[PDB]
From Swiss-Prot:
GO CC, one annotated term: cell cortex
Effect of residue 145 to A: Abolishes enzymatic activity
UniProt KW keywords: Apoptosis, ATP-binding, Calcium, Cell cycle, Cell membrane, Kinase, Lipid-binding, Membrane, Nucleotide-binding, Phosphoprotein, Serine/threonine-protein kinase, Transferase
Lineage of producing organism: Eukaryota, Metazoa, Chordata, Craniata, Vertebrata
Domain notes for this protein: The KA1 domain mediates binding to phospholipids and targeting to membranes.
Protein name in the entry: Maternal embryonic leucine zipper kinase
GO MF, any single term: ATP binding
Modified residues (Phosphothreonine): 51
Residue numbers of the full-length protein present here: 6 to 333 of 651
Active site residues per record: 127 (proton acceptor)
Domain Protein kinase, first and last residues per copy: 6-243
Family the entry assigns: Belongs to the protein kinase superfamily. CAMK Ser/Thr protein kinase family. SNF1 subfamily.
């Protein structure tokens, strides 16, 4: 209803919180994903989502899944998001059992990039797990659900015991757990009772498979220090020996597509369409409301990047 700015297609994952519906932006012809939140189901965590959405308006990175449009009806919230055909990182591992060191490295370098960018913008994800890591058609990673139950396995020990934590030192712990599951295909700390799970995280002791290389084991033990003072810093991680073991350059965390100025061709096409001049069109865009204009601009930008003509129907 009312979001007939879009033709609706397939359903690609329902949660008891938010469902995702596939869609097509009428004007641009561009494929999109729609996260459908129900305000009734949220309730005591609506500002949780509003703050999540407000962070997501200020993040423009190649490994962050792009927000196009927010739409809030009487009872529903619609997030219009970058289309990620490739699927989830979680489902990518379970199908390969585990990834090669060389492939984990390729993927890991992308997580580091997305996460470093986020930090530089003065945010921490505070939930890095393979269920938040989507793949595009070019098999590049995109980061989702910035939100902050079964994230207890990926939780930092100082986060567990309600101590004073830094959001980056936590993000580093999470990336250690993720690095483990990438190479092994199972969790380093895992238990049926959640108290014994909490015990193993504090103990800091974990299994090491025979297939793990020494540099791997060594990076893992740098990353899964219980004491946050002892954990590897984000700064030291970008140019780490292991990280640079195949592609001998540090992580390119800097946004490769910054929001700088508005694109000329997009502004001219929106001016002809919305039947007003360049300046009145530019002012209207620069307001960045995450309405249909923001979606049309950002999706015309997408169309331009593909080498398709910068035109609405
Ligand atoms: O576009 C998304 N996923 C997607 C799109 C197409 C297909 C899939 C996932 C998986 N089956 C093949 C087709 C997507 C993007 C963002 C998001 F938060 C949730 C889902």
């Amino acid at each position: 209803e009312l979001l007939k700015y879009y033709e609706l297609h397939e359903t690609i994952g329902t949660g008891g919180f938010a469902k995702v519906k596939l869609a097509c932006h009428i004007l641009t012809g561009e494929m999109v994903a729609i996260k459908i939140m129900d305000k009734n189901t949220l309730g005591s965590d609506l500002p949780r989502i509003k703050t999540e959405i407000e962070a997501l308006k200020n993040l423009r990175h190649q490994h962050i899944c792009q927000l196009y449009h927010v739409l809030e009806t009487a009872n529903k919230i619609f997030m219009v998001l970058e289309y990620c055909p490739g699927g989830e990182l979680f489902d990518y591992i379970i199908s390969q059992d585990r990834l090669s060191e060389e492939e984990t490295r390729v993927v890991f370098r992308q997580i580091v990039s997305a996460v470093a960018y986020v930090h530089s913008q003065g945010y921490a994800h505070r939930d890095l797990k393979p269920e938040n890591l989507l793949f595009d058609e070019y098999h590049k990673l995109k980061l989702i659900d910035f939100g902050l139950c079964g994230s207890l396995a990926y939780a930092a020990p100082e986060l567990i015991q309600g101590k004073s934590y830094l959001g980056s030192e936590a993000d580093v712990w999470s990336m250690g757990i993720l690095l483990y599951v990438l190479m092994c295909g199972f969790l380093p700390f895992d238990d049926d009772t959640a108290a014994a799970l909490v015990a193993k995280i504090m103990r800091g002791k974990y299994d090491v498979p025979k297939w793990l290389s020494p540099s791997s084991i060594l990076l893992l033990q740098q990353m899964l220090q219980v004491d946050p003072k002892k954990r590897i810093s984000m700064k030291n991680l970008l140019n780490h020996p292991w990280i640079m073991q195949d592609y001998n350059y540090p992580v390119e965390w800097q946004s490769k597509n910054p929001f700088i100025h508005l694109d000329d061709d997009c502004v001219t096409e929106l001016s002809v369409h919305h039947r007003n001049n360049r300046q009145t069109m530019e002012d209207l865009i620069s307001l960045w409301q995450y309405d249909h204009l923001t979606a049309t601009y950002l999706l015309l930008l997408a169309k331009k990047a593909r080498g398709k003509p910068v035109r609405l129907r």
